[PDB]
Amino acid sequence: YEHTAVMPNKVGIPYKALVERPGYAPVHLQIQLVNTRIIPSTNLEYITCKYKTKVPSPVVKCCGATQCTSKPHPDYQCQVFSGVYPFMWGGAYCFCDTENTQMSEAYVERSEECSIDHAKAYKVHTGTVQAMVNITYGSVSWRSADVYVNGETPAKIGDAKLIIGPLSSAWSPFDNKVVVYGHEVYNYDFPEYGTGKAGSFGDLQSRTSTSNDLYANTNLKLQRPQAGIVHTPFTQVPSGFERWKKDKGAPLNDVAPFGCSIALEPLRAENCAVGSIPISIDIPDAAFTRISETPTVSDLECKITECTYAFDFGGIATVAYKSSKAGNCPIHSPSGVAVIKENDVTLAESGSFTFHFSTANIHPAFKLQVCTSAVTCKGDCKPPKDHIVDYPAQHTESFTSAISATAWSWIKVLVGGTSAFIVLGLIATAVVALVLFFHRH
Amino acid sequence: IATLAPEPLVEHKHRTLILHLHPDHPTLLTTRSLGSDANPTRQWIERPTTVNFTVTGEGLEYTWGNHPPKRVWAQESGEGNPHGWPHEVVVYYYNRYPLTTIIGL
Structure with a gap:
């Protein structure tokens, strides 16, 4: 047989459904999600890290003049300073007064911490969504294997093929450009490897961490050495990657809506709760027994003994039956008012059992089916005294859940x-129209 | 090894979580809501302060210090009672739906 329905997109709450093959005993089906990962497709454009400007030894040809070529280096610098007359240890460097030459070249390269901490720049594009489902039906125990959330690919769990339908929302928490620094991801724009504004994010851009081509503009300007010493000074703006580490806002795993938890290694966005997921499960024909070997109940009367508004299983009701024979048969409430904690009950000849439920209604007018037979339950509920709890709601709050019997009486009076x-x-208008017509003829 | 903050004193009111924070170092407290809008707050606590956070039925998640994050949900307790005189029915639905009964009356 095949049972198709729609489940909500919530993780810790199981979805209970009762398949109904006529002529056979019903089978209680329970589908429960474990994960929900939205996995976009990324490509790595470039990385970035703090630089380390290295200075070669300057040449001192100090009777004459020297010139340089243009070596291929990121942010390479040349200068010639004339008439320096330096003073090393053990006297002055050379005899020629007031006409000298010092080169003092400089060159920018990446640091040795770039292997440990760096920021990876990614462009995302919408990709696969997959999830892990825990399932059971009938007497089969819980067996789990992850599926693909698209309405095409079936997955064999146990002996039943499950086709998890597409999500009703196309929402993904990643913008088109993300930065992955260490443990958390961000939503930040790139200069796209061509430009770098020398102080914000693309002062140093490298296509791979071991790559040989480097982009670097750090405004490296050479300076004249002073007072007759051999050293090479320079001035440059600080690294924008070190500045971005100070000013970075909150990461995406702290401002994500719908309670998404962001993981890293395939860049998932796990356990969001948005929309709904249709299902379609093909159940094997060997899981159905004939109805002549199962209990069948009649003369059902349902009484609710205690009900509580809270979204904990505080609702209790006992019903009275008289089955045809002893055995086990499941219970289920198909309406959206209340969910039922129990899956199946053990019956006898003319006994009574109790079940625990959970509702968000003041007056639950739900019905439940036991042993392919329905019975309507009614009662009143009281609000709870706890104000804040640490578990999600089991039920679903409707629009007319909070309206009581006294509020319905005042609406109908109004x-x-x-x-x-x-x-x-309108009646008195049409009455005087007839007596004015009857005055004439 | 990084320092662990002292535990806050949590106090519950109707749709409000109150946190008494007594740190000894400048400590980060970030919260978000688990609804369609995050509405995120982020602040560094240096002196002992108290902060009141509005928790709806969708939820709220707060991280304090280096502690793992905790999630809290608000129930439907309310203040009035729906059965009774009209000065009690109006009060009960105002504490539950504060805007709908203003334009509903």
Whole structure:
């Protein structure tokens, strides 16, 4: 047989459904999600890290002049300073006064911490969504294997093929450009490897951590050495990667809506709760027994003994039956008012059992089916005294959940007497029209 | 090894979580809501302060210090009672739906 329905996109709450093959005993089916990972497709454009400017030894040809070529180096610098007359240890360097030459070249390269901490720049594109489901049906125990969340690919769990339908929302928490620094990801724009504004993020850009081509503009400017010493000074703006580490805002795993938890190694966005997921499960024909070997109940009367508004299993109801024979048969409430904690019950000849439920209604008018037979339950509920708890709701809050019997009485008094007032005006209008017509002829 | 903050004193009111924080170092406290909008707060606590956070039925998640994050959900307790005189029915639905009964009356 095949049972198709739609489940909500919530993780810790199982979805209970009762398949109904006529002529066979019903089978209680329970589908529970474990994970929900939205995995986009990324490509790595470039990385970035703090630089380390290295200075070669300057040449001192100090009777004459020297010139340089243009070596291929990121942010390479040349200068010639004339008439320096330096003073090393053990006297002055050379005899020629007031005409000298010092080169003092410089060159920018990446540091040795770039292997440990760096920021990876990614462009994302919408990709696969997959999830892990824990399932059971009938007497089969819990067996789990992960599926693909698209309405095409079936997955064999146990002996039943499950086709998890597409999500109703196309929402993904990643913008088109993300930065992955260490443990957390961000939503930040790139200069796209061509430009670098020397102080914000792309002062140093490298395509791979071991790559040989480097982009570097750090405004490296050479400076004249002073007072007759051999050293090479320079001035440059600080690294923007070190500045980005100070000013970075909150990461994406702290501002994500719908309670998404962001993981890293395939760049998942795990356990979001948005939309709904349709299902379609093909159940094997060997899991159905004939109805002549199962209990069948009649004369059902349902009484609710205690009900509580809270979203904990505080609702209790006992019903009275008289089955045809002893055995086990499941229970289920198909309406959206209350969920049922129990899966199956053990029966006898003319006994009574109790089940625990959970509802968000003041007056639960739900019905439940036991042993392919339905019975309507009614009662009143009281609010709880706890204000904040640390578990999610088991039920679903509707629109007319909070309206009580006294509030319905005041609405019907208001609506009923308003229309009765305005109809009496319409009745009395048509009454004097007849007696004015009857005056003439 | 990084320092661990002292535990806050949590106090519960109707749709409000109150946190009494007594740190000894400048400590980061970041919260978010588990609904369709995150509405995120982020602040460094240096002196002993108290902060009140509004928790709806969707949830709230707060991280304090180097502790693991904790999630809290708000129930439907309320203040009035729905059965009774009209000065009690109106009060109960105002504490539950504060805007809908203003334009509903």
